[PDB]
Design a protein around this nucleic acid. Sequence first.
DNA 1: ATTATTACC
Length: 100
Amino acid sequence: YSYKRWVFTINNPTFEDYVHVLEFCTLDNCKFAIVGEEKGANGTPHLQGFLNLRSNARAAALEESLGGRAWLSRARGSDEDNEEFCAKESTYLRVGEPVS
DNA sequence: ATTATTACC
């Protein structure tokens, strides 16, 4: 039950949430990663992203890697589907290139 | 696992 391709959301992200995302979402760990940040007026601020990991991870392990407050789900769309969705966010961090 | 109603297809 360990997988490479995941989506995640971190609602009301904390300092440590950002620190975990910044250290983990790197080319060392990911073939491709994209993480958007939205914190506008009438909604809960979030980090929201997609990870195509180099190594399989069990959900409990990825949860720890992302700071322990993340919602996780096995990715259902393609890397490019996720790139297009997350790149709509007003700020985003993009690591690597989508795999097809 | 986990905070939320946001979350790819």
